Design a protein around this motif. Structure first.
Motif, PDB file in Angstrom:
ATOM      1  N   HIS A  80     -33.860   6.442  -2.921  1.00 39.92           N
ATOM      2  CA  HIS A  80     -34.613   7.623  -3.299  1.00 39.92           C
ATOM      3  C   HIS A  80     -36.161   7.205  -3.328  1.00 39.92           C
ATOM      4  O   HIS A  80     -36.847   8.263  -3.217  1.00 39.92           O
TER       5      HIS A  80
ATOM      6  N   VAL C 366     -30.799  26.308 -15.386  1.00 37.35           N
ATOM      7  CA  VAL C 366     -30.666  25.058 -14.429  1.00 37.35           C
ATOM      8  C   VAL C 366     -31.715  25.184 -13.304  1.00 37.35           C
ATOM      9  O   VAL C 366     -32.267  24.056 -12.968  1.00 37.35           O
ATOM     10  N   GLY C 370     -34.420  22.610 -13.506  1.00 36.13           N
ATOM     11  CA  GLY C 370     -34.417  21.782 -12.398  1.00 36.13           C
ATOM     12  C   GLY C 370     -35.395  21.485 -11.411  1.00 36.13           C
ATOM     13  O   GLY C 370     -35.699  20.445 -10.745  1.00 36.13           O
ATOM     14  N   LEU C 371     -36.333  22.628 -11.159  1.00 39.45           N
ATOM     15  CA  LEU C 371     -37.491  22.494 -10.551  1.00 39.45           C
ATOM     16  C   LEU C 371     -38.445  21.579 -11.426  1.00 39.45           C
ATOM     17  O   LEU C 371     -39.292  20.862 -10.687  1.00 39.45           O
ATOM     18  N   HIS C 374     -37.074  18.164 -10.835  1.00 39.81           N
ATOM     19  CA  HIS C 374     -37.084  17.423  -9.460  1.00 39.81           C
ATOM     20  C   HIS C 374     -38.475  17.183  -9.153  1.00 39.81           C
ATOM     21  O   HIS C 374     -38.681  16.198  -8.607  1.00 39.81           O
ATOM     22  N   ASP C 386     -42.278  16.092  -1.558  1.00 44.08           N
ATOM     23  CA  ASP C 386     -41.017  16.741  -1.724  1.00 44.08           C
ATOM     24  C   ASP C 386     -41.061  17.530  -2.961  1.00 44.08           C
ATOM     25  O   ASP C 386     -39.971  17.922  -3.526  1.00 44.08           O
ATOM     26  N   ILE C 393     -43.353  21.867  -0.954  1.00 47.54           N
ATOM     27  CA  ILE C 393     -42.747  22.993  -0.939  1.00 47.54           C
ATOM     28  C   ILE C 393     -43.328  24.000  -1.841  1.00 47.54           C
ATOM     29  O   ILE C 393     -43.529  23.842  -3.190  1.00 47.54           O
TER      30      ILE C 393
HETATM   31  C1  CLA Z   1     -31.707  23.397  -9.947  1.00 48.86           C
HETATM   32  C2  CLA Z   1     -32.819  23.183  -9.703  1.00 48.86           C
HETATM   33  C3  CLA Z   1     -33.203  22.346  -8.526  1.00 48.86           C
HETATM   34  C4  CLA Z   1     -33.580  22.954  -7.312  1.00 48.86           C
HETATM   35  C5  CLA Z   1     -33.404  24.275  -6.731  1.00 48.86           C
HETATM   36  C6  CLA Z   1     -33.753  21.491  -6.474  1.00 48.86           C
HETATM   37  C7  CLA Z   1     -33.971  21.673  -4.918  1.00 48.86           C
HETATM   38  C8  CLA Z   1     -34.222  20.705  -4.226  1.00 48.86           C
HETATM   39  N1  CLA Z   1     -33.865  19.327  -4.482  1.00 48.86           N
HETATM   40 MG1  CLA Z   1     -33.716  18.468  -6.600  1.00 48.86          MG
HETATM   41  N2  CLA Z   1     -33.109  17.871  -8.307  1.00 48.86           N
HETATM   42  C9  CLA Z   1     -32.831  18.561  -9.434  1.00 48.86           C
HETATM   43  C10 CLA Z   1     -32.941  19.982  -9.497  1.00 48.86           C
HETATM   44  C11 CLA Z   1     -33.210  20.931  -8.517  1.00 48.86           C
HETATM   45  N3  CLA Z   1     -33.629  20.594  -7.303  1.00 48.86           N
HETATM   46  C12 CLA Z   1     -32.734  17.656 -10.589  1.00 48.86           C
HETATM   47  C13 CLA Z   1     -32.502  18.229 -11.850  1.00 48.86           C
HETATM   48  C14 CLA Z   1     -33.111  16.389 -10.125  1.00 48.86           C
HETATM   49  C15 CLA Z   1     -32.801  15.373 -10.933  1.00 48.86           C
HETATM   50  C16 CLA Z   1     -31.399  14.823 -10.726  1.00 48.86           C
HETATM   51  C17 CLA Z   1     -33.215  16.505  -8.752  1.00 48.86           C
HETATM   52  C18 CLA Z   1     -33.313  15.527  -7.885  1.00 48.86           C
HETATM   53  C19 CLA Z   1     -33.239  15.456  -6.468  1.00 48.86           C
HETATM   54  C20 CLA Z   1     -33.463  14.295  -5.458  1.00 48.86           C
HETATM   55  C21 CLA Z   1     -33.318  12.993  -5.975  1.00 48.86           C
HETATM   56  C22 CLA Z   1     -33.648  14.843  -4.264  1.00 48.86           C
HETATM   57  C23 CLA Z   1     -33.687  16.299  -4.515  1.00 48.86           C
HETATM   58  C24 CLA Z   1     -33.951  17.014  -3.467  1.00 48.86           C
HETATM   59  C25 CLA Z   1     -34.215  18.583  -3.379  1.00 48.86           C
HETATM   60  C26 CLA Z   1     -34.353  19.355  -2.135  1.00 48.86           C
HETATM   61  C27 CLA Z   1     -33.073  19.239  -1.204  1.00 48.86           C
HETATM   62  C28 CLA Z   1     -31.860  19.430  -2.155  1.00 48.86           C
HETATM   63  C29 CLA Z   1     -30.479  19.690  -1.226  1.00 48.86           C
HETATM   64  O1  CLA Z   1     -29.999  19.087  -0.495  1.00 48.86           O
HETATM   65  O2  CLA Z   1     -30.142  21.246  -1.422  1.00 48.86           O
HETATM   66  C30 CLA Z   1     -28.808  21.218  -1.466  1.00 48.86           C
HETATM   67  C31 CLA Z   1     -28.423  22.718  -1.440  1.00 48.86           C
HETATM   68  C32 CLA Z   1     -27.176  23.044  -1.471  1.00 48.86           C
HETATM   69  C33 CLA Z   1     -25.960  22.352  -1.133  1.00 48.86           C
HETATM   70  C34 CLA Z   1     -26.820  24.776  -1.574  1.00 48.86           C
HETATM   71  C35 CLA Z   1     -26.939  25.188  -2.968  1.00 48.86           C
HETATM   72  C36 CLA Z   1     -27.641  26.397  -3.192  1.00 48.86           C
HETATM   73  C37 CLA Z   1     -26.993  27.610  -2.524  1.00 48.86           C
HETATM   74  C38 CLA Z   1     -27.996  28.202  -1.484  1.00 48.86           C
HETATM   75  C39 CLA Z   1     -26.560  28.581  -3.528  1.00 48.86           C
HETATM   76  C40 CLA Z   1     -26.075  30.016  -3.026  1.00 48.86           C
HETATM   77  C41 CLA Z   1     -25.469  30.974  -3.795  1.00 48.86           C
HETATM   78  C42 CLA Z   1     -24.915  32.238  -3.302  1.00 48.86           C
HETATM   79  C43 CLA Z   1     -26.003  33.058  -2.961  1.00 48.86           C
HETATM   80  C44 CLA Z   1     -23.938  32.944  -3.962  1.00 48.86           C
HETATM   81  C45 CLA Z   1     -23.563  34.266  -3.544  1.00 48.86           C
HETATM   82  C46 CLA Z   1     -22.648  34.380  -2.478  1.00 48.86           C
HETATM   83  C47 CLA Z   1     -21.951  35.682  -2.362  1.00 48.86           C
HETATM   84  C48 CLA Z   1     -23.243  36.395  -1.628  1.00 48.86           C
HETATM   85  C49 CLA Z   1     -20.889  35.630  -1.088  1.00 48.86           C
HETATM   86  C50 CLA Z   1     -34.445  20.962  -2.756  1.00 48.86           C
HETATM   87  C51 CLA Z   1     -35.882  21.249  -2.436  1.00 48.86           C
HETATM   88  C52 CLA Z   1     -34.115  16.229  -2.250  1.00 48.86           C
HETATM   89  C53 CLA Z   1     -35.409  15.897  -1.400  1.00 48.86           C
HETATM   90  O3  CLA Z   1     -36.339  15.162  -1.563  1.00 48.86           O
HETATM   91  O4  CLA Z   1     -35.686  17.182  -0.762  1.00 48.86           O
HETATM   92  C54 CLA Z   1     -37.286  17.907  -1.157  1.00 48.86           C
HETATM   93  C55 CLA Z   1     -33.745  14.776  -2.722  1.00 48.86           C
HETATM   94  O5  CLA Z   1     -33.867  13.613  -2.318  1.00 48.86           O
HETATM   95  N4  CLA Z   1     -33.481  16.608  -5.750  1.00 48.86           N
END
Ligand code: CLA
Ligand code: CLA
Ligand code: CLA
Ligand code: CLA
Ligand code: CLA
Ligand code: CLA
Ligand code: CLA
Ligand code: CLA
Ligand SMILES: CCCCCCCCCCCCCCCCCC(=O)OC[C@H](CO[C@@H]1O[C@H](CO)[C@H](O)[C@H](O)[C@H]1O)OC(=O)CCCCCCCCCCCCCCCCC
Ligand SMILES: CC1=C(C/C=C(\C)CCC[C@H](C)CCC[C@H](C)CCCC(C)C)C(=O)c2ccccc2C1=O
Ligand code: SF4
Lengths: 617, 89, 645
Positions: A80, C366, C370-371, C374, C386, C393
């Motif tokens: 990371h 969450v 999580g924002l 993150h 990132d 972003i």
């Molecule tokens: C919950 C809040 C949240 C959010 C929105 C994000 C968002 C993000 N993180 Mg992140 N992160 C978070 C919490 C969060 N983080 C926390 C708490 C930690 C600490 C453990 C981290 C640690 C972390 C690391 C270490 C890294 C990220 C990264 C990223 C980016 C890529 C993630 C990825 O592959 O997406 C995966 C997304 C999915 C698999 C999709 C899930 C969401 C879908 C769209 C939901 C859809 C629901 C649907 C609408 C339901 C209705 C369906 C029906 C109509 C049929 C992205 C901007 C990476 C980065 O650097 O990118 C900038 C990266 O390396 N994160």
């Protein structure tokens, strides 16, 4: 299968090592086998540390310049990291005195460290082999004679690797020789030896041979005292476990004190962070071991003791007196320490610092001057100056240390009050006369009789562990601020601002957090970024513990029931999950209290570790 | 290269000197891994032994060794009791 | 007779041996205002309300008395930039350092908005406030002891009550305040801003003053009436006149023939009315907190930053407390009604509503935290591109950046209020939404699972406030609607604390930004909030630790009182932890040992020492928790905003 609830996990995992309830391996041979497995785990953990120090570490560069090099623990390969953070970080630095210990015990190369790792792995394999075959024969292994023999062998090792061993003439072949010949490896100089600023390896080896011989003699004396007056009237795994835990806690706390004041590892006092971490870690371990001694005493009372006219029977009969007097001591200490601290706070706030109540610690000063100090520092009791003084790191006390020690006494007495009260009321109170038939841990006795929350004996430990952590926090704040003032040469900011608690905030906590918070910001991130992140993580864990402690089950059980309703009514999933398999139920009351305490203390430990690293870096 | 954080790292001027080579090469790391694999096999054996507990026939069908016989008869080494106590005497 | 009945509760407490315990005393306090259902319940409620009005009148009289005698109100009139102090502190002990206490209640700005220029007027207002308090106490006495039963006011005479409140109280009060403004609050502010001396206020009601000196009815008067401190009062007068007109007209143009309390008992009707009234008052308090800094209405108010901060934070806290109490009394009314069939649709959609709210809360929590985490992780890992920020972003709140509409002769509030929002605003607003949703979840769960639940099926038999049902069914602690309000109060504390933190950091950031100088016009980000309020570490460093310097370095300064209250708030908050984490049984056994110690010395108290009941312990812990947290924030905010502004 698996038609149980999620409560099964936290019900069995809380007793998964309560082997007395495990009828299969209930024999003491199995418990010795568990000890062997635990020692194998310890050996593998030490092998981990030695392997990563010798693999990616600068021990060969550390022995050359122990003052000018920072010990490396292991290589960091986090995916990371950003290239900059990768270029920024060299490797995970060292927060433990293993480099100093290896240097002291004669390690001079990474080849020796690698052989040490191989030996540790082989010894762990030996421990696993011994655990494979529990047997009354293996119950013979151990005893104070065995540990004294281990001490003697360690003395032999230290003699073999003492710095003066090169000048040593072989005693077993050319005779003992002159006294200086033995002084090459066996000395009693006493105190810091200057240079390395630690006890001489000759001193440690001589200490260990003396301790081993004395331990052999003491074990023989105890066993002849078992010859006549042979009475094993109360044998219990919990009684002996309480004895071992209390002795180990005393020894570990003494280790912290006497390792700060008489460091035995070369060039250790020059490393401030490792010294502070050593003291804090060992004090926490000692307090935990003492608390465990009290807990297992309570357990022995709960389910292994039979009432008699013995020592424990006498303690139980007058348990009201013990609890009442401990309550009086705690009330007096808390009232007066808090009141004096608040008075000093008011005086300092009102711009009148002279009108504070500063009771000089004249008794501890008298002890220090008469028994320890070799020069007149305070002049009370004695004023003689030693012609040939010895060196050490004993701090010089002042007015604030009186109040801090009274806070320490309040914490210790309150912890002992809670633990003793719970253990002695495990036999029953007038709110719960039949606690002898309910086991060590249970939720409550219901809302009847006015309420019975936290009435269990386990709940006594649950309440007293907050006090354990609070007392350790108090005296570790004391030690950390004292040594920070000594190293920063202030020694007057402490002696004046520790009288009032706003000093404890501003000059200790707020002041020493300046660099830690700058671990990462908009400008960038430095080597302290990991510790700021751990600081935040520990706060999060602490507040989750707050969640598990404040909010209780019923609410959460109803909420989980509604969530189960959502799942069973959800599309595409009612065909797959009927909630029959591992039914999601709220944590039981005891499980919830323990998990809240666990989060609380995990956040406690990680917060203070991150703060210590960020302050003494 | 590191960005120093903390007043004492800057004040004392301690430098994290990276060793020129690695320190354990690759062959000795492999030997350590092999020994750890043997330790892992022993740990699996111990886990299987402990999880299923001690079978009832052993310590009942296997006669005690003369050492164990005399120790149980004379009550030594934690026998004549219900405790473990590694620091017995 | 009446004096005998004044201690009648204590006489009943000592009459029976079952009530000769300290628990009886705590119950006597807890059941003090819990007016039981009886023929005189409405009399009791109305008399208690009137007594509270008298108490508030005492408070207002005291505040005006301090303004008259112990305040530099005249000096503040001559120079609004000086620190408003209205509390002298005598030289006792050593407290002389804080002798002038800068009051941040905004009474100086209020009085200036009322046309008060002399401390004699404040003395008169204090005297009339004491007279009004005496009259309110007389009326409360009378109504409790000799008046109508009042049982018809919520069901039968609800139309009359509502119509009177609509027309008389609200509309006529707004009209009278508009008259007061136009007649003495506008002219006095005109003559003060122009510095041409102020005559007696009654001399403005002469028909020969500026009322007929010039008949021009726009912004044109003697010399140059260009005072912009005066225009907000003109707008307030116009608003009050229009509001009075619309209230009076719409009251007679409204049905009002629909009382939803026919199916509820008198006690439950009172509790439901109290709940809805608390909801309205709380949302009104929150709205006023927003509008105080959203729109300038008091003279020299925005200039006094501590006053603005104090008004915002105080009214936010009061709004949160009253919003929680709204659901508290809704739960009380539902659980204490014999046949509350009115809420049938929501008690039959219990699990549906609760579970959808549960998913909403889980999703919001969450996502928002999580924002934040993150951003923390990316900044720690050295990955600023990132993160969730403007230079990364970007979570731009697009729905905020649009208010354009057809003009139709409008202005000012036709936009986003002239403020641009960024990623930090988006994330903190979602944090606010999540915390509000969680508080509402707890409160709505307490309301819905008040009469029955899947765990305990007779919770209506247990009334509103009970500790538990027992350790059975795995454990049923904290199932009561009271316990749900107890948890919702913690979550309201969390929500409002985050809200006031957001407001305070934004306010300080704006103050620093407008302190660019004049030439500095690229604020880039700067905006310390916008640049740093994206991490939990960012908050912990640049807001809490950064601003705590003022409150911890206040010793020897007039803010030493704020420092001491900071310490005391921490102490009370940890004592709360003591009460919340522990349980009744242990303390009972400890008291048993202490009572043995007493009996050993022939002391033997007869009011048997009992430790606080489970609900009493939870309530004490919650009270201390709220007091400690709110006091810590109070001391911190006040010290930071007074030392630095
Ligand atoms: C919950 C809040 C949240 C959010 C929105 C994000 C968002 C993000 N993180 Mg992140 N992160 C978070 C919490 C969060 N983080 C926390 C708490 C930690 C600490 C453990 C981290 C640690 C972390 C690391 C270490 C890294 C990220 C990264 C990223 C980016 C890529 C993630 C990825 O592959 O997406 C995966 C997304 C999915 C698999 C999709 C899930 C969401 C879908 C769209 C939901 C859809 C629901 C649907 C609408 C339901 C209705 C369906 C029906 C109509 C049929 C992205 C901007 C990476 C980065 O650097 O990118 C900038 C990266 O390396 N994160
Ligand atoms: C050598 C010392 C020793 C030994 C042999 C024992 C042995 C025993 N203890 Mg005991 N104990 C000890 C020391 C010891 N204890 C000490 C020092 C304390 C004080 C802290 C206690 C307090 C204690 C209590 C209060 C109880 C026991 C109980 C027991 C019995 C059952 C153990 C069990 O199943 O627990 C289950 C073990 C666990 C659930 C382990 C918890 C896992 C930890 C919390 C993981 C968390 C760490 C995590 C990785 C950190 C993450 C950080 C985060 C930031 C990510 C068993 C006979 C129980 C008993 O006899 O009741 C009848 C019991 O109730 N002990
Ligand atoms: C308490 C007794 C004790 C302990 C803990 C140690 C510990 C150690 N000695 Mg040592 N030593 C001792 C007594 C002791 N010694 C005595 C009495 C002498 C004098 C005869 C020596 C002479 C000695 C020398 C000459 C050297 C050490 C070295 C070492 C280190 C690596 C040894 C190793 O694991 O690889 C060797 C062992 C193995 C590869 C396998 C382990 C042996 C069996 C299989 C396990 C034993 C099971 C156990 C007894 C139960 C290690 C720190 C070496 C070093 O670098 O230290 C600076 C080294 O060169 N020792
Ligand atoms: C700041 C937080 C805080 C404080 C002040 C206390 C205070 C106390 N706890 Mg405690 N506790 C806490 C947190 C705290 N706890 C938490 C979080 C837990 C975990 C659940 C516990 C768990 C716990 C247990 C399990 C036990 C205690 C006990 C005690 C008492 C010990 C006796 C003592 O020191 O009296 C001193 C009292 C105080 C310092 C309270 C403040 C009193 C005043 C304000 C300070 C003095 C001012 C001045 C001198 C008075 C003026 C007099 C006149 C001029 C009017 C005491 C009342 C023990 C007990 O009750 O034994 C008696 C006990 O068994 N506590
Ligand atoms: C809203 C309620 C309220 C509050 C919180 C206060 C608070 C205060 N008043 Mg006060 N006051 C009030 C209403 C209130 N007043 C009313 C309604 C009146 C009109 C009768 C006064 C008239 C008044 C005077 C005349 C004085 C105060 C003073 C004080 C201060 C010290 C009080 C004292 O010495 O205790 C004494 C309490 C008793 C003797 C118990 C009876 C304190 C800040 C004093 C002050 O500021 O000194 C510089 C002072 O001299 N007040
Ligand atoms: C248990 C803790 C403790 C102790 C021992 C003291 C003791 C003292 N405080 Mg103190 N204080 C405390 C807690 C405590 N305080 C707390 C918790 C706070 C925070 C609210 C303060 C705030 C405080 C202030 C602000 C001041 C003091 C002052 C004083 C001193 C004067 C007392 C006096 O003349 O009383 C007067 C009362 C009597 C003398 C009683 C009458 C005599 C009896 C009845 C005789 C009986 C017959 C024999 C005294 C040494 C004062 C000072 O500076 O003095 C140095 C002062 O101004 N205190
Ligand atoms: C124009 C006449 C008039 C005016 C100015 C008021 C004014 C007031 N009434 Mg009121 N009232 C009126 C007619 C009026 N009433 C009539 C005709 C009835 C009989 C149906 C009532 C029955 C009534 C009750 C039952 C209560 C009030 C209350 C109140 C006070 C607070 C109102 C509130 O917050 O909502 C509510 C306020 C001072 C409340 C109060 O604080 O009591 C003192 C309250 O509980 N009023
Ligand atoms: C219009 C406002 C209003 C009114 C009229 C009522 C009226 C009532 N409420 Mg209620 N409530 C309100 C707002 C209101 N509430 C709000 C806003 C909340 C959320 C915080 C609640 C939460 C609540 C609960 C949880 C309960 C009630 C209950 C009750 C009933 C009995 C109250 C009683 O005996 O208290 C007696 C008076 C007290 C206990 C006051 C003691 C002081 C409090 C606890 C703390 C004050 C600390 C103070 C501010 C700081 C001190 C200063 C510092 C410097 C030291 C009564 C019908 C109870 C009931 O059973 O209803 C039927 C009940 O269980 N209410
Ligand atoms: C840094 C480390 C510090 C954090 C560790 C601090 C933990 C405090 C030490 C206390 C441990 C002993 C307590 C104990 O065993 O009993 C604490 C209780 C005792 O177990 C309880 O016993 C009761 C009757 O005695 C009932 O049976 C309860 O159901 C049963 O939970 O254990 C539990 O509650 C376990 C639940 C949590 C298990 C999760 C496993 C976590 C593993 C992750 C690694
Ligand atoms: C301490 C404690 C008690 C014991 C509390 C009791 C017995 C209340 C009595 C305390 C007295 C009344 C304190 C009086 C006030 C103090 C002297 C401090 C105020 C005055 C000073 C500031 C001078 C409980 O009964 C209890 C019940 C349920 C959960 C947690 C707890 C709990 O934590
Ligand atoms: S169920 Fe919960 S609230 Fe009720 S007595 Fe047990 S622990 Fe206390």
């Amino acid at each position: 299968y698996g038609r149980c609830a999620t409560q099964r996990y936290f019900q069995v995992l809380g007793n998964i090592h309560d082997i007395e309830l495990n009828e299969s391996l209930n024999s003491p041979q199995a418990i010795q086998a568990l000890s062997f497995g635990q020692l194998s785990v310890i050996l593998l953990w030490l092998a981990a540390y030695t392997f990563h120090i010798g693999w990616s570490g600068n021990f060969e560069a550390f022995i050359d310049n122990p003052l000018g090099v920072q010990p490396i623990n292991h290589f960091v390969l986090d995916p990371h990291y950003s290239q900059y953070k990768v270029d920024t970080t060299i490797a995970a630095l060292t927060n433990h005195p293993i480099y100093h210990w290896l240097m002291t015990v004669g390690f001079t190369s990474n080849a020796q460290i690698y052989r040490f790792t191989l030996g540790l792995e082989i010894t762990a394999a030996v421990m696993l082999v011994l655990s494979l075959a529990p047997s009354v024969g293996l119950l013979s292994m151990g005893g104070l004679e065995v540990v004294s023999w281990i001490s003697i062998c360690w003395a032999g090792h230290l003699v073999n690797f003492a710095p003066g061993a090169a000048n040593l003439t072989n005693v077993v072949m050319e005779g003992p020789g002159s006294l200086g010949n033995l002084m090459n490896v066996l000395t009693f100089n006493g105190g810091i030896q200057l240079g390395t600023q630690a006890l001489a390896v000759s001193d440690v080896a001589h200490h260990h041979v003396a301790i081993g011989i004395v331990g052999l003699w003491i074990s023989a004396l105890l066993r002849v005292s078992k010859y006549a007056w042979n009475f094993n009237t109360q044998s219990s795994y919990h009684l002996d476990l309480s004895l071992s835990l209390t002795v180990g806690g005393i020894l570990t706390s003494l280790l912290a004190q006497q390792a700060y004041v008489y460091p035995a590892l070369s060039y250790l006092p020059y490393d401030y962070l490792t010294t502070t971490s050593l003291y804090v870690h060992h004090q926490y371990i000692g307090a935990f071991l003492a608390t465990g001694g009290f807990v297992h005493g309570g357990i022995f009372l709960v389910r292994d003791y039979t009432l008699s006219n013995d020592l424990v029977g006498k303690l139980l009969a007058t348990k009201a007196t013990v609890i009442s007097t401990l309550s009086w001591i705690t009330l007096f200490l808390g009232f007066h320490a808090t009141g004096l601290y608040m008075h000093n706070d008011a005086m300092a706030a009102f711009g009148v610092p002279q009108k504070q109540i500063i009771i000089e610690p004249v008794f501890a000063e008298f002890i220090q001057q008469v028994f320890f100090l070799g020069t007149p520092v305070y002049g009370l009791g004695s004023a003689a100056v030693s012609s040939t003084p010895t060196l050490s790191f004993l701090p010089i006390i002042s007015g604030g240390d009186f109040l801090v020690h009274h806070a320490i006494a309040l914490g210790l007495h309150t912890t002992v009050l809670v633990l003793i009260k719970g253990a002695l009321d495990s036999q029953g109170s007038y709110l719960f006369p039949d606690k002898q038939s309910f086991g060590y841990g249970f939720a409550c006795d219901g809302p009847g009789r006015g309420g019975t929350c936290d009435i269990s004996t386990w709940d006594s430990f649950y309440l007293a562990f907050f006090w354990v952590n609070n007392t350790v926090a108090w005296f570790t704040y004391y030690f950390h601020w004292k040594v920070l003032s000594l190293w920063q040469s202030s020694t007057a900011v402490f002696d004046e601002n520790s009288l009032y608690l706003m000093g404890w905030f501003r000059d200790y906590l707020w002041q020493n957090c300046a660099a830690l918070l700058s671990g990462y910001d908009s400008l960038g991130s430095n080597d302290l970024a990991v510790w700021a992140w751990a600081f935040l993580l520990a706060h999060l864990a602490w507040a989750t513990g707050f969640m598990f402690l404040i909010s209780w089950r019923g609410y959460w059980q109803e909420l989980i029931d509604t969530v189960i309703y959502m799942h069973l009514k959800a599309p595409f999933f009612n065909e797959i999950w009927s909630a029959d398999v591992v039914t999601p139920v709220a944590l039981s009351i005891v499980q919830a209290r323990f998990i809240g305490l666990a989060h609380y203390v995990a956040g406690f430990i990680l917060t203070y570790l991150a703060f210590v690293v960020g302050a003494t870096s | 290269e590191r960005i120093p954080g903390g007043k004492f790292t800057k004040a004392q001027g301690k430098i994290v000197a990276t060793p020129d080579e690695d320190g354990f090469t690759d062959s000795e790391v492999a030997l350590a891994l092999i020994i750890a694999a043997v330790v892992l096999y022993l740990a699996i054996e111990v886990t299987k032994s402990l999880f299923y507990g001690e079978d009832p026939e052993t310590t009942a069908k296997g006669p005690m060794t003369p050492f164990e016989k005399r120790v149980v008869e004379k009550g030594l080494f934690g026998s004549r009791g219900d405790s473990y106590s590694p620091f017995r005497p | 007779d009446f004096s005998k009945a004044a201690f009648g509760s204590a006489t009943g407490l000592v009459a029976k041996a079952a009530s000769q315990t300290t628990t009886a005393i705590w119950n006597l306090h807890a059941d003090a205002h819990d007016f039981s259902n009886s023929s005189y319940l409405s009399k009791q409620v109305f008399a208690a309300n009137l007594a509270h009005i008298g108490v508030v009148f005492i408070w207002l009289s005291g505040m005006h008395f301090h303004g008259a005698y112990f305040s530099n109100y005249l000096d503040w009139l001559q120079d609004p930039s000086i620190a408003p102090t209205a509390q002298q502190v005598s030289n006792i002990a050593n407290q002389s350092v804080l002798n002038p206490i800068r009051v941040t209640s905004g009474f100086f700005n209020l009085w200036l908005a009322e046309g008060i220029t002399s401390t004699y007027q404040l003395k008169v207002i204090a005297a009339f406030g004491l007279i009004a308090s005496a009259l309110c106490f007389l009326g409360s006495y009378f109504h409790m002891h000799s008046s109508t039963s009042f049982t018809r006011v919520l069901n039968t005479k609800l139309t009359s009550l509502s119509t009177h409140h609509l027309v008389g109280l609200l509309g006529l009060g707004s009209l009278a305040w508009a008259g007061h403004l136009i007649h003495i609050s506008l002219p006095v502010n005109i003559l003060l801003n122009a510095g041409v001396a102020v005559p007696s206020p009654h001399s403005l009601l002469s028909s020969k003053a500026v009322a007929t000196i010039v008949e021009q009815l726009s912004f044109s008067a003697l010399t140059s009436s260009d005072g912009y401190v005066w225009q907000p009062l003109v707008y307030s007068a116009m608003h009050h006149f229009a509001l009075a007109l619309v209230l009076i007209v719409g009251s007679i143009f409204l049905s009002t023939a629909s009382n939803p309390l026919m199916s509820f008992t008198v006690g439950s009707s009172w509790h439901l009315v109290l709940g809805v009234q608390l909801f309205v008052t709380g949302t009104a308090s929150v709205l006023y907190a927003q509008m105080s800094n959203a729109y300038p209405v008091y003279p020299y108010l925005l200039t006094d930053h501590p006053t603005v901060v104090s008004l915002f934070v105080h009214h936010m806290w009061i709004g949160g407390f009253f919003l929680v109490g709204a659901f508290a009394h809704l739960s009380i009314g539902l659980v204490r009604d014999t046949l509350p069939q009115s809420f049938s649709v929501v008690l039959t959609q219990r699990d549906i509503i609760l579970g959808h709210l549960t998913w909403v809360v889980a999703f919001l929590g969450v996502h928002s935290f999580g924002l934040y985490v993150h951003n923390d992780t990316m900044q720690a890992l050295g990955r600023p591109d990132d993160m969730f920020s403007d230079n990364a972003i970007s979570l731009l709140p697009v729905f905020a950046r649009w208010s354009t509409l057809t003009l139709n002769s409008t202005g000012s509030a036709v936009s986003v209020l002239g403020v641009e929002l960024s990623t930090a605003d988006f994330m903190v607003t979602h944090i606010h939404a999540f915390t509000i949703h969680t508080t509402v979840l707890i409160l709505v769960k307490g309301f819905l699972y008040a009469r029955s639940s899947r765990l305990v099926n007779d919770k209506y038999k247990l009334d509103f406030r009970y500790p538990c049902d027992g350790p059975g069914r795995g454990g049923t602690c904290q199932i009561s609607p009271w316990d749900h309000v107890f948890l919702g109060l913690f979550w309201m504390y969390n929500s409002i604390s985050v809200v006031i933190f957001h407001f305070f950091w934004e306010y300080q950031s704006n103050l620093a930004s407008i302190k660019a100088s004049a030439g500095g016009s690229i604020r880039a980000l700067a905006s310390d909030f916008e640049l740093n309020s994206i991490n939990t570490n960012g908050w912990l460093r640049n807001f809490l630790w950064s601003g705590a310097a003022q409150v911890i370095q206040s010793y020897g300064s007039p803010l030493a009182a704020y420092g001491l209250t900071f310490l005391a708030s921490h102490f009370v908050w940890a004592l709360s932890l003591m009460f919340l984490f522990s349980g009744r049984g242990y303390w009972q056994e400890l008291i048993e040992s202490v009572l043995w110690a007493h009996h050993k010395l022939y002391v033997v108290p007869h009011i048997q020492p009992r430790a606080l009941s489970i609900t009493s312990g939870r309530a004490v812990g919650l009270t201390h928790y709220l007091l400690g947290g709110i006091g810590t924030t109070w001391s911190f905010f006040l010290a930071r905003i007074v030392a630095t502004a």
